[PDB]
Amino acid sequence: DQRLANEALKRGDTVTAQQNYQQLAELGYSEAQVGLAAQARLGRLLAAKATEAEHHEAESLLKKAFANGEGNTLIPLAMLYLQYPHSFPNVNAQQQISQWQAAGYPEAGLAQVLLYRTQGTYDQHLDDVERICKAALNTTDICYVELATVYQKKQQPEQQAELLKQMEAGVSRGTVTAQRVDSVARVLGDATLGTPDEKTAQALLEKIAPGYPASWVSLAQLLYDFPELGDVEQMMKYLDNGRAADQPRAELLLGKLYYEGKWVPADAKAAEAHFEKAVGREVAADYYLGQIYRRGYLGKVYPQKALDHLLTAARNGQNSADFAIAQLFSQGKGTKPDPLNAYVFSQLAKAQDTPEANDLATQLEAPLTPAQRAEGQRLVQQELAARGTLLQLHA
Numbered sequence: 474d475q476r477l478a479n480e481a482l483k484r485g486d487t488v489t490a491q492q493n494y495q496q497l498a499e500l501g502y503s504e505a506q507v508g509l510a511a512q513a514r515l516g517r518l519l520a521a522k523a524t525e526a527e528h529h530e531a532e533s534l535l536k537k538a539f540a541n542g543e544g545n546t547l548i549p550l551a552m553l554y555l556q557y558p559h560s561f562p563n564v565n566a567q568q569q570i571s572q573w574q575a576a577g578y579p580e581a582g583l584a585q586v587l588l589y590r591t592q593g594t595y596d597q598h599l600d601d602v603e604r605i606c607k608a609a610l611n612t613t614d615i616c617y618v619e620l621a622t623v624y625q626k627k628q629q630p631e632q633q634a635e636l637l638k639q640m641e642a643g644v645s646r647g648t649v650t651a652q653r654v655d656s657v658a659r660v661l662g663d664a665t666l667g668t669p670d671e672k673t674a675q676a677l678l679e680k681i682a683p684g685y686p687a688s689w690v691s692l693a694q695l696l697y698d699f700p701e702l703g704d705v706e707q708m709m710k711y712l713d714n715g716r717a718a719d720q721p722r723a724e725l726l727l728g729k730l731y732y733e734g735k736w737v738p739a740d741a742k743a744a745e746a747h748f749e750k751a752v753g754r755e756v757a758a759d760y761y762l763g764q765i766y767r768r769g770y771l772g773k774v775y776p777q778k779a780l781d782h783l784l785t786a787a788r789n790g791q792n793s794a795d796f797a798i799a800q801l802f803s804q805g806k807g808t809k810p811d812p813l814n815a816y817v818f819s820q821l822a823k824a825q826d827t828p829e830a831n832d833l834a835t836q837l838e839a840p841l842t843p844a845q846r847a848e849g850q851r852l853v854q855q856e857l858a859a860r861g862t863l864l865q866l867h868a
């Protein structure tokens with residue numbers, strides 16, 4: 474039935490677009506850089522708002538303002554196509570972006586880079602990235618992050634030192650902010666990108682933390698990932714600096730420490746205490762509080778709390794909560810099993826697109842009859858709809 478399958482696809486663009494935003498933000502991209510900043514204002518508001526009517530109203534509103542020399546319309550349009558392709562059968566984003574590059578539009582290369590990042594082909598075009606970004610570097614500060622990424626994957630130490638000096642030189646001249654430097658540093662401290670320059674990442678971070686406090690968290694997180702160049706003494710210092718600056722993520726990582734007890738003696742109620750303070754400021758809090766209640770870590774197991782907090786996180790964009798809610802309903806260990814919910818949530822976790830999620834979704838659909846599967850699939854979409862359709866503060 475290509476009727477619903479083509480409905481499930483449009484709702485899959487929706488969860489995938491949210492994840493792409495979160496990953497671009499984590500990486501350092503500003504809202505301007507990801508296309509979130511008359512027909513111009515409107516067509517842009519709509520594209521990043523939405524129903525398939527708004528996606529199409531957005532396209533046209535943008536496509537027009539474009540022809541009429543309205544800057545800040547190309548990135549917004551490219552994101553629309555890249556984030557909801559199943560809403561645009563008429564378009565082939567890559568060709569569209571290839572046209573704009575040929576035309577000479579300044580923001581084309583950036584659009585082209587957002588392309589490799591959204592579709593997942595980055596590693597195949599490190600050369601094209603390098604080229605696009607060397608040319609836009611003095612006009613698009615996010616390119617410092619992309620070149621540092623390239624020089625990390627291409628394992629090119631020399632080019633990185635030149636880049637870093639260009640970046641420092643720009644700090645001196647006032648053309649580079651502390652957030653860029655922080656982002657570049659986190660690139661240098663990414664064991665995933667190849668051969669990390671952790672110490673350089675540290676030198677960079679320490680200079681900027683006093684005035685860009687999110688760096689205390691980056692520093693703490695940098696020790697966690699390279700445990701061998703700082704003591705619990707430091708860790709706890711960077712974290713204190715973080716707590717003092719009012720950085721909710723400081724509470725988050727601190728509670729994670731007492732949760733895995735690999736840096737300090739595993740302590741159950743302390744972590745809950747710490748994660749609790751990030752609740753409402755960091756979606757992961759709800760997720761880490763959900764695990765504790767699922768694994769019964771506080772000596773005992775609390776089913777309804779675990780679901781409650783795990784669902785909240787899943788409904789707020791947490792890419793791992795649905796997977797967990799699946800495990801909660803299947804592994805027993807305190808929680809009575811429920812095959813249907815297990816399925817529905819392992820299917821929702823599939824949308825996050827991970828082998829782990831695939832591997833779990835096939836095991837949990839195995840127990841269902843063809844009717845239950847169609848029922849559960851009915852629930853999957855009902856639930857995705859609700860998320861799309863969607864506060865209170867303490868003190």
Ligand SMILES: [Cl-]
Nearest residue numbers: 595622665666
């Ligand atoms: Cl990457």
